[PDB]
Amino acid sequence: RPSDPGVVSYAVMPKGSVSNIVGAPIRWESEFTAPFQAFSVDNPVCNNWADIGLPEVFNDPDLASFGGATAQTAAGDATHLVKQAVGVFATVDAADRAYHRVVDRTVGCAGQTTAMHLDNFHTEVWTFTGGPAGPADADWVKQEAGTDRRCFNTTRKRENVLLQAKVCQSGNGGPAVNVLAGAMQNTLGQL
Amino acid sequence: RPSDPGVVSYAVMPKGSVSNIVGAPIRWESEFTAPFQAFSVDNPVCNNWADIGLPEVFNDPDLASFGGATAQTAAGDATHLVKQAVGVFATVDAADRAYHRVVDRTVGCAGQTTAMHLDNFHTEVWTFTGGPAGPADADWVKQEAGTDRRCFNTTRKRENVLLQAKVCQSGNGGPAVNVLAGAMQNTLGQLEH
Ligand SMILES: [Mg+2]
């Protein structure tokens, strides 16, 4: 069955739960209640892979509710960084259109390196990889140029819900992002 | 079964419950115990769609009890705004007449844009949409001109009760206003046996 808009208050895992999933201290988080994009990317095809919880993906006449969080090792320390975004749509079709704004608009991003101009006047360079998106599930990775830092991303469309999770770290945040997306999905009350 | 007048004391969802329903912080609320109208509209057929809990709808010889609340994100922040009004009438027919003061007097409002003059001296321009009212359920939407802000409204007649709920936000407050109206109805003690 479809989710009520209230599920966003429950579907975002708090920093304690995030710490238990990544296997590292997570002492800082910031919650958000609206989609936001805090950067511009040079290559437009990579916009909807460059972060999650984006306005062009989620903002829609049929967006009923939205919540997310960014969690980190500590204030000023993103050694581990974890982000979550959950949108509840009025219809299953609207959630499908939001899913397709992620996966249709990023065809050609895989294999590209591009500059992210952050709104705080920092510039980062990221290399994107990812296989073809599924009907309701899309994974991709970005790696920061000259580092072993990779962000593992997953997007999940479940009935009238679109959710996204991102785990950034050295090594492989993929296992953690899959455990986290599972934990988020388990709250949706869709049976 | 009709509701006793006392149900208005617990039919209005507090800000904590409203927050759980809309899925966003709701830190501010103001309760009221009398119908009020804090505006005028240029086009009179849109009066009873322009807000809920109105005197011309609820005030009546057979109004037994009345309560409502307005709730917001925070004191000066209406990013989410939610309003509720519950009237208990002495008779089911009096509740039906109150329902018809909403739905009869707003025929022609759908498709109209009109100015709302607020008591605080501000002017807002709203575009009204809505299908024909049902026998006991009337829904409509108003959109603020030049914005994605929409207020989803539901008016429901249940035995001797008229209830109204309004959820204002960007995107679609429709699912939340339906959950909220359901939560309000669940307190009315109307299950027949
Ligand atoms: Mg009876």
UniProtKB/TrEMBL annotation, chain B:
Keywords: Signal
Organism: Mycolicibacterium smegmatis (strain ATCC 700084 / mc(2)155)
Gene3D superfamilies: PknH-like extracellular domain
Transmembrane segments: none
Keyword match Signal: yes
Domain (PknH-like extracellular): residue spans on this chain: 4-186
Superkingdom of the organism of origin: Bacteria
Name assigned to this protein: PknH-like extracellular domain-containing protein
Disulfide bond sites: C46-C109, C151-C168
